[PDB]
Amino acid sequence: TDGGITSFVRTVLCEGGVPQRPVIFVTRKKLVHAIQQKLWKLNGEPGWVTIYGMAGCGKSVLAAEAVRDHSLLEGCFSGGVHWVSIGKQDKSGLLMKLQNLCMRLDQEESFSQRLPLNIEEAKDRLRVLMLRKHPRSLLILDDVWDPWVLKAFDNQCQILLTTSDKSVTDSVMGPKHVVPVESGLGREKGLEILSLFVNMKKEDLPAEAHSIIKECKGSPLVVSLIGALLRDFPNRWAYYLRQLQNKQFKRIRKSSSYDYEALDEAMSISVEMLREDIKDYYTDLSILQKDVKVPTKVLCVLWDLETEEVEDILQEFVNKSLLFCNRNGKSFCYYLHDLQVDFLTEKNRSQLQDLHRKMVTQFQRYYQPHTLSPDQEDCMYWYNFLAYHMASANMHKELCALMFSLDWIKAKTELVGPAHLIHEFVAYRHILDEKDCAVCENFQEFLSLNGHLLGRQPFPNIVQLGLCEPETSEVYRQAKLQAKQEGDTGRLYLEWINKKTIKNLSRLVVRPHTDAVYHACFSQDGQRIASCGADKTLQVFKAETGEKLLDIKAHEDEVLCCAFSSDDSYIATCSADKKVKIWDSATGKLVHTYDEHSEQVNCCHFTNKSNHLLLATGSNDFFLKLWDLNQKECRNTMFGHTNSVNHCRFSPDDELLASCSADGTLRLWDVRSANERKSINVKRFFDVEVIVKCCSWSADGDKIIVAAKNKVLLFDIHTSGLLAEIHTGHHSTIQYCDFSPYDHLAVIALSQYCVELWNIDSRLKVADCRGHLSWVHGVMFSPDGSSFLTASDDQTIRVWETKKVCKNSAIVLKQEIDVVFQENETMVLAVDNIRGLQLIAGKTGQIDYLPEAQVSCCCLSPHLEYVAFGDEDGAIKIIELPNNRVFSSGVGHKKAVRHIQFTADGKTLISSSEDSVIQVWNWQTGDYVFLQAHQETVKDFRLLQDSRLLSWSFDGTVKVWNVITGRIERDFTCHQGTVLSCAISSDATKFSSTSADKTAKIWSFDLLSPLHELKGHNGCVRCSAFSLDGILLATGDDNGEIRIWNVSDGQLLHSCAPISHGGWVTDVCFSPDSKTLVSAGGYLKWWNVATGDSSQTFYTNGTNLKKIHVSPDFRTYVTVDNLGILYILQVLE
Ligand SMILES: Nc1ncnc2c1ncn2[C@@H]1O[C@H](COP(=O)(O)OP(=O)(O)O)[C@@H](O)[C@H]1O
């Protein structure tokens, strides 16, 4: 103990969070130095310096002592250092840490306020602060337990960590180091310690001394404790050597309590010796977890006291070495050494349940769940713990109360993401949602859809998000009320009338994981399913009710795949720990481990015949191993692939093995010999690298389908020729699939949550499957094919019954519709997503179908009665609804049919395609009128006043034909490149402006020169509309920007163009009162004329809407999201 401090060393250390010294200290300079060395030994280059040793051996004090020296600090870590007590944390745990470490580094919000909402995101926010804003800085990680934790800090920093297990640096690369520190200490120091406690100096240090130390085993913790004991009772020097002689502490799990023995005792005694008023107090601290620092106030609420007092009490403890503390900024938070917690949790074992109940109670006596203003030192603590303490005390009532609250949901999420709350619902399900009620799934399924939104600022109106749930759901009832309680307060909540029609309600959803499900598969009999994922476990349920049958902790890392044996006897799993495990489908006990791959493993599949039993695995080691489960060893290793092997199914007839790699080849192996028999290069792409995944065999096993980027391919296992090729969603990437045994059906996981299954051979999508809203990973048919399952990042497996998903539902449509706000009801007409078109009667499902050659656009005749639609080949037809059959079809049109529309009167159809000619079919009579623009390709038109019709194209040209006489009454060359949207001033029509690539020029059907150009928009005005007379015209920009310009020929009224919109502002429209501008693009969003927005609410599952249909009164709406969801909104009662 002395002084090498510099009031600088101070700042740098008190800043970063480094702890100070322990009451009494003994310069272990020999190692303070040992460590320091390895630190300079990093130079500039980032590295890893690990100070490991048995728990309670000094490390944490050693670390601090290392960076407690100016010489080493400046010129090395001149930027500073940051202490981060991590300890043993699960996933959600490390998150609360990182969240903290960020609330500290960007304490200036220098890079967006609000903390990161998840590990990954925090990794970055971190990597930035360390590599700028705080460079040349050291990161001190106190007590690390798992390798993976280090890989999150692997961001070019020089990190000094401490651990009780050196093997934590095997999941990270860099010039690592090691500074071994024994578990014990040396008598001379141990003595020093005692000495400095009793105020002696080895001179008066009794005989016992040398023996006591020998008993405390050197552990500075143990010693110091005893030393604090021998100091508070100067006589028992030999009395205690006696207690320590024989460890009279009795804990369950006697067996081999390593470091305990000496410690448990030290504690046992000192504790029993506390005064009889503060002794009850220390007992309560039995509910404070390892590597968790509590703040003064958390205790005030527990004990009904105040700062000073609560601090004095706890002081007596820190002084006696029964507690620890460090600054937080005038405010103090105290921790407990790991071992001391294990002590207490064992000692006051039978009392733990009550302490967690005495807490919470003391939290309701002072606070409110949804009233914790985020300035209270204790704030955080509660959010990420109140929910735990309650469960940790088993309080069905209490808990359900806090987690079934819309208000807590908001409250918490806005502060720390939904990341935690999501875990919790799953963790505390066992106690939470009991009885019969599924008031859970509701809140659970709630946290899945709108997951992405919560915690993301501008914070969503948690009420609307709820209104969007099933009527039956509690999330709704709580949101319906929350609303009806404020009736008339300038808000107005919209309401999804047909919220019911949508929702492909799968026959069953299962939630058994804490993290993304990466795979699943039915048992041969189809009765069960196994599903492994990043929750590091295996999980097997009934294909019936999801009734859990097995909950194994499979591996010590993420699990990339799993499958059942040929007779459902075993379930094997293979992961990134490079291990392949076989389990007992029955007992679920380990049955054997095959560790031979160099890299992670992915494909693991059993032989199909109930005769022989083998297992084939693919890895990133490029090999493919065949295991003979009846042998302690591997049966083969297929050297062959160029890159990583991904998928691989055994041919029905167990003689061939298929292999699908990243090297762009499909490869057939002869099981018996294990020799490459064929290799199929996938070259359908435009040297280029392509990855082939999912790849199943056909019934007869004389064919095989495989998936590469944006296609599925059917190959003849013989000719090695290609039999069929179906392209998928424009441009994405099939992430998985699975050939069905019957009907040529093949389900495929498209890019992100969208999952559609097709019908090869007819090569036509058969049915879309909107179900998840979080990246889908796996998907496959039950053996018999009757049904299929899906696994995604929303960490849920959902069974689906095939027959039912394929029926022609009006659930999902294309984004080509036409609305009819006929008063007492809204009527939408939409192009189906598969074949015909649907006549939807919003406010009474009533879905009527109409077969057809895959239309390309729809069209309703005001009065209904006649429905018209364009076609893909340019064909046009009209069908009369009353009859719903007799249809009339005119001839014309070379390209597909875009906008098509009926004339004011019941006859004459206008329709533009993808070329210069507009068409005016005055059907019924049969006469035709053409409008040879000679232009380029009419972008779109609009039925003007009296038989006059405004047109515009990729020529900046706008025109005013007149039907019944293809005669150009007006021509304008008002843009040098593609006109995009432009409206008329409806009332009268004195004006009619445009908006092309640049800005929006508004003119007057007269002056063959635009009134005043409206420059500014830095994206490209892609729409606009005039204010129902009101003298205003809003222009929707491309990057979300949206300015409202004023009808005074040329100005620049307010630009309420936030984004801090969501990609493209494809539409707008003013209220009949010229006060409410409602925009549409990535999602709906209203505004307040002249500065500020409004009910910016309503977010849709999907996005990139196009045209938002507003009824007359602005109290009814209709739109469709790129997920085929038809939203028919209508303001709340
Ligand atoms: N050099 C030292 N001098 C005095 N006491 C020490 C010393 N090192 C550790 N201790 C005692 O042990 C505690 C710190 O233990 P710690 O270093 O955090 O264990 P670990 O290294 O396994 O994390 C302190 O409360 C202190 O009384």
Helices (H), 657-759: none
Q: Which is the closest atom of ligand 1 to the Cα of 324?
A: 25
Cα–Cα distance, 1010 to 422 (Å, whole number): 56
Contact 966, 934 (CB under 8 A): no
d(C-alpha 1096, C-alpha 288), whole Å: 43
Calpha distance 480→903 (Å, rounded):
42
CA separation (Å) from 1006 to 28, 289, 880? Answer: 93, 79, 40
Give the number of the atom of ligand 1 that is nearest the alpha carbon of residue 58: 17
Residue 247 tokens read as: 């460890």
Residue 24 alpha carbon, nearest atom of ligand 1:
4
Pairing relationship of beta strands 948-952 and 764-769 according to DSSP bridges: unpaired
Q: Domain 275-348 maps to which CATH number in 3.40.50.1100, 1.10.3720.10, 3.30.450.20, 1.10.10.10? A: 1.10.10.10
Please list, residue by residue across 1013-1038, b when 16 or more beta carbons sit within 10 angstroms of its beta carbon and e when fewer do: ebebbebbbbbbbbbeebebbbbbbb
Residue 238's H or E segment, with its range, is helix 237-245
Contact 129, 70 (CB under 8 A): no
Amino acid identity of residue 760, one-letter, is I
Strand blocks (E) in 69-136: 80-85
- Three-class SS string for 544-584? CCCCEEECCCCCCCCCCEEEECCCCCEEEEECCCCEEEEEE
How many Å apart are CA 369 and CA 810, to the nearest integer?
Answer: 43
- CA-wise closest residue to 407 among 438, 363, 444, 369: 369
3-state secondary structure of 1129: coil
H or E, element range at 1086: strand 1085-1086
CA distance 1058 to 1040: 7
Which amino acid belongs to residue 758? W
Residue closest via CA to ligand 1's atom 17 equals 58
Query: Residue whose CA is closest, atom 13 of ligand 1?
Result: 221
CATH architecture of 184-274: Orthogonal Bundle (1.10)
Do 139 and 153 contact (CB within 8 A), yes or no?
yes
Using DSSP's 3-state secondary structure scheme, residue 41 falls into coil
CATH 3.40.50.11900 correct for 504-807 = no
Residues contacting residue 147 through CB under 8 Å, at least 6 positions apart: 167, 168, 169, 170, 171, 172
Crossing angle of helices 406-416 and 474-484, in 10° steps, is: 90
> Using the 8-state DSSP alphabet, how is residue 1087 labeled?
B
Q: By CB neighbour count within 10 A (0-12 exposed, 13-18 middle, 19+ buried), where does 278 fall?
A: middle
Cβ proximity of 648 and 660 under 8 Å: yes
How far, rounded to the nearest angstrom, does the alpha carbon of residue 811 sit from its chain's CA centroid?
26
| Three state DSSP letters for 537-554 | CCCEEECCCCCEEECCCC
Residues 173, 153 contacting (CB under 8 angstroms): no
Calculate how far, in angstroms, residue 212's C-alpha sits from the geometric centre of ligand 1. Answer: 18
Q: Residue 458, preceding bond cis, omega within 30 degrees? A: yes
Please give the Cα distance from 1106 to 407 (Å, whole number): 33
Cα–chain-centroid distance for residue 377? 29
Read off the tokens for 155. 């961001």
Helices and strands in the chain: count of H runs, count of E runs: 25, 63
First-to-last CA distance in the chain?
74
**Measuring from atom 21 of ligand 1, which residue has the nearest CA?**
59
**Which residue blocks in 801-958 are alpha helix, DSSP H?**
802-805
Give the closest residue (by CA) to ligand 1 atom 3: 25
From 2, 224, 293, give the residue whose CB has the most ligand 1 atoms within 8 Å, as the site to mutate: 224
Task: Give the sheet arrangement for strand 1025-1026, strand by strand.
Answer: 1025-1026, 1032-1036, 1042-1046
Instruction: Give residues (CB < 6 A) around ligand 1.
Output: 22, 24-26, 28, 55-61, 143, 193, 220-221, 224, 321, 324, 337
Burial of residue 337 (number of CB atoms within 10 Å: 0-12, 13-18, 19+):
buried
Cα separation, 749 vs 733, in Å, equals: 9
For ligand 1, atom 18, the nearest C-alpha belongs to: 60
What number of other Cβ atoms are within 10 A of residue 999's Cβ? 21
CA dihedral sign of residues 141, 145, 150, 152: negative
Contacts of residues 927-934 at CB distance under 8 Å and 24 or more positions apart, as own/partner, are 928/890, 928/892, 929/963, 929/964, 929/965, 929/966, 930/966, 931/961, 931/966, 932/966, 933/957, 933/959
- Ligand 1 centroid–CA 21 distance in Å is 9
The answer to whether residues 787 and 799 touch, using CB atoms and an 8 Å cutoff, is yes
In the chain, where the domains are located: 1-183, 184-274, 275-348, 349-489, 490-503+808-1133, 504-807
Question: What secondary structure letter does DSSP report for 533?
Answer: B
- The beta-strand segments (E) located in 281-373 are 294-295, 324-329, 331-335
Residues whose CB falls within 8 Å of the CB of residue 823, separated by 6 or more in sequence, listed in order: none
CA gap 830, 848 in Å, rounded: 11
Best residue among 35, 183, 221 to mutate for probing ligand 1's pocket (most ligand atoms within 8 Å of CB) is 221
DSSP code of 726? Answer: E
3-state secondary structure of 880: strand
d(CA 712, CA 540): 30
DSSP 886: -
555 neighbors 536 (Cβ within 8 angstroms): yes
Give the CA radius of gyration of the chain.
Answer: 35
The CA-atom distances, in angstroms, between 790 and each of 176, 519, 679, 764, 986 are 42, 8, 30, 21, 50
Count CB neighbours of 482 within 10 A: 16
Cα–Cα distance list, 360 to 299, 369, 426 (Å): 12, 10, 21
Atom of ligand 1 lying closest to residue 28 CA: 1
CB 696 within 8 A of CB 704: yes
Query: Do the first three CATH levels of 490-503+808-1133 and 504-807 match, i.e. the same topology?
Result: yes
Other C-beta atoms lying within 10 Å of the C-beta of residue 593: 11
Token pair 């029964």 in the structure block, residue: 322
Pairing of strands 48-52, 158-163: parallel
* Rounded CA separation 443/593 (Å): 39
1-183 is a CATH 3.50.50.60 domain = no
Q: Tokens at residue 1022, please? A: 């892609």
- Separation of alpha carbons 55 and 182, rounded Å: 10
CATH for 349-489, options being 3.40.190.80, 3.30.160.40, 1.25.40.370, 3.40.605.10: 1.25.40.370
| Residue 1004: DSSP 8-state | -
Question: What's the angle, vertex CA 399, arms to CA 393 and CA 404, rounded to 5?
Answer: 165
Rounded to the nearest 5 degrees, what angle is found at the Cα of 539, between the Cα atoms of 533 and 541? 130
For 185, other C-beta atoms within 10 Å of its C-beta total: 24
Amino acid in the structure at residue 916: S
Residue 832: its H or E element: strand 826-832
Q: How far is CA 365 from the centre of its chain?
A: 36
Four-residue CA torsion sign, 494, 495, 501, 506 = positive
H or E segment and range at residue 126:
helix 119-130
- Sheet containing strand 561-564, strands side by side: 561-564, 570-574, 579-584, 590-595
Write the DSSP symbol of residue 83.
Answer: E
What is the Cα–Cα distance from 219 to 54, expressed in whole angstroms? 9
Other Cβ atoms less than 10 A from the Cβ of 103: the count is 16
Nearest to 961, CA basis, from 1033, 903, 896, 1003: 903
What DSSP designation does 1084 have? -
The CA–CA distances, whole Å, from 216 to 62, 207, 266, 572 equal 19, 15, 8, 47
Q: For ligand 1, atom 5, which residue shows the shortest CA distance?
A: 25
Determine the distance from the C-alpha atom of residue 602 to the mean position of all C-alpha atoms in its chain, rounded to a whole number.
23
Q: Does domain 490-503+808-1133 have CATH number 2.130.10.10?
A: yes
Q: Are 161 and 176 in contact (CB under 8 A)?
A: no
Alpha-helix residue ranges (DSSP H) falling in 939-1025: none
Q: Are 56 and 120 in contact (CB under 8 A)?
A: no
Beta strands in 320-410 (DSSP E): 324-329, 331-335
C-beta of residue 767 within 8 angstroms of C-beta of residue 834: yes
User: How many other CB atoms are there within 10 angstroms of residue 930's CB atom?
Assistant: 13
Residue 730 CA, distance from chain mean position: 25
Q: How remote is the CA of residue 326 from the centroid of ligand 1, in Å?
A: 14
Q: State how far the alpha carbon of 921 is from the alpha carbons of 272, 582, 788, 878, 889, in Å.
A: 99, 70, 47, 11, 10
Q: Which helix (H) or strand (E) holds 147?
A: helix 147-150
Tokens of residue 1122, six digits: 């790129």
Q: What is the resolution of this structure in A?
A: 3.5
Q: Which atom of ligand 1 is nearest to the CA of 55?
A: 22
Q: Cα separation of 678 and 652, whole Å?
A: 17
Residue 892: closest CA among 905, 911, 867: 911
- Smallest CA separation from ligand 1 atom 23, residue: 60
Q: Which atom of ligand 1 is least distant from the CA of 53? A: 22
- Name, in order, each residue with C-beta under 8 angstroms of 1056's C-beta and a sequence gap of 6 or more: 1042, 1043, 1044, 1087, 1088, 1091, 1092, 1093
**Cα–Cα dist 210/641, whole Å:** 66
Query: Which value, to the nearest 10 degrees, does the dihedral of the CA atoms of residues 197, 200, 206, 209 take?
Result: 40
Breaks (C-N over 2.5 A) in the chain follow: 686, 1060
Q: How far apart are CA 308 and CA 323, in angstroms?
A: 16
Four-CA torsion 307, 308, 309, 310, nearest 10 degrees = 40
- Bridge partners (DSSP) of residue 900 are 911
